């Protein structure tokens, strides 16, 4: 019973970072070697574990978190760190045992003239506890004056839309990041 690592990596459409998917891969043979053969990688990094020695190890839970991030903001997915994405959308823990996989997707994820589907949480009152998620679309409040439903002035819609076009530079090009947290699941 091979693990569904094939399904996680070749999703036709991923989700925005603010609402990131999660898959509890449990009770299957991992076979991590399938990643290199099929998908070329941009930033293949692991913390607390080794790439080659990943197959000959046993874990009870190997999670999988997937989202799409700007190229220059991939580096915010790491232990600690501060930024728009790490602090307010998806915060990794300090003592992190897992692997982070990032590979370019400008060929497919970029749209013809606009990819306003993907959003990130620009405004939040405070940082996120490690491995958390917020999908609230309530209007943010700025200033002691009470905030009504209409955004208008001093109240903002938190989520802000990426702009993806094929002519954009490598910094602003779309990327796909899958984080496999570690915690039966013993590869061959």
């Amino acid at each position, epitope marked *: 019973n091979l693990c569904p690592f094939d399904e996680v990596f070749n999703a036709t459409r991923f989700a925005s970072v603010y609402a990131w998917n999660r898959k509890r891969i449990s009770n299957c043979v991992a076979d991590y070697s399938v990643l290199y053969n099929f998908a070329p990688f941009f930033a293949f990094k692991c913390y607390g574990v080794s790439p080659t020695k990943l197959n000959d190890l046993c874990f009870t839970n190997v999670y999988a978190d997937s989202f799409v991030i700007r190229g*220059n*903001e991939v*580096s915010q997915i790491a232990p600690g760190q*501060t*930024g*728009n994405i790490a*602090d*307010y959308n998806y915060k990794l823990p300090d003592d992190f045992t897992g692997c982070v996989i990032a590979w370019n997707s400008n060929k497919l994820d970029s749209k013809v003239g606009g990819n306003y589907n993907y959003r990130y949480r*620009l*405004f*939040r*009152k*405070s*940082n996120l506890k490690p491995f958390e998620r917020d999908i609230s679309t309530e209007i*943010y*409040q*700025a*200033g*002691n*004056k009470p905030c009504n439903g209409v955004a208008g*002035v*001093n109240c*903002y819609f938190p989520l*802000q839309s990426y*702009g993806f*076009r094929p*002519t*954009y*530079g*490598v*910094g*602003h090009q779309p990327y796909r990041v899958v984080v496999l947290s570690f915690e039966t699941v013993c590869g061959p």
Partner: antibody
Amino acid sequence: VQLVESGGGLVQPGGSLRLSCAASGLTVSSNYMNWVRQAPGKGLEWVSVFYPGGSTFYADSVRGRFTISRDNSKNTLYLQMNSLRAEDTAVYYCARDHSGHALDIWGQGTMVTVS
Amino acid sequence: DIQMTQSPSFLSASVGDRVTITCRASQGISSYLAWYQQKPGKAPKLLIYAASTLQSGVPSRFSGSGSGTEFTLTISSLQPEDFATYYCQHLNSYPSMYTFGQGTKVDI
């Protein structure tokens, strides 16, 4: 909303100053607030930034000598500097960020010259 | 890293005609760019933000539209009070963040 700024004057090289950003209408502990520098007869430059969370990013030219602070008691923003002859010879501005790129509410500048 | 530069620099424009300003961004750019106006000896105020969004209190006289690397702003009316200076910006990654680039000057 108004952002009146105080502090300034002349400080000798190697001295220290602090500037306070008084804001009446917006919460300093809820908005992206930042410091903008403008030498006389030249373009603008960016100094600091201070997120709603406990985060702060500095420019390369103002790192290690410039410290920013926020006090919700007075609803004001403070910048602490340990001046240098060419690091601080400019008017300083206080601003808020609406859409993650645009600074709208710019306060009146404060002259901070070193001699 | 990207560098923001403006081609016109100094300009001479009369009351009757219009003025067109352009600032370029190296290595491509997103759709987020803001235009500022700074009369001499005054704190600058936001004029146009994002992609030709226009702002409350900014006259419909001003309109700045562009996409990708080539960005520009144009003024349609006769410019009664001759404007002075204008700037671009774009927020960036950790080290640089706000990049304003060289200024622009327009007058009679």
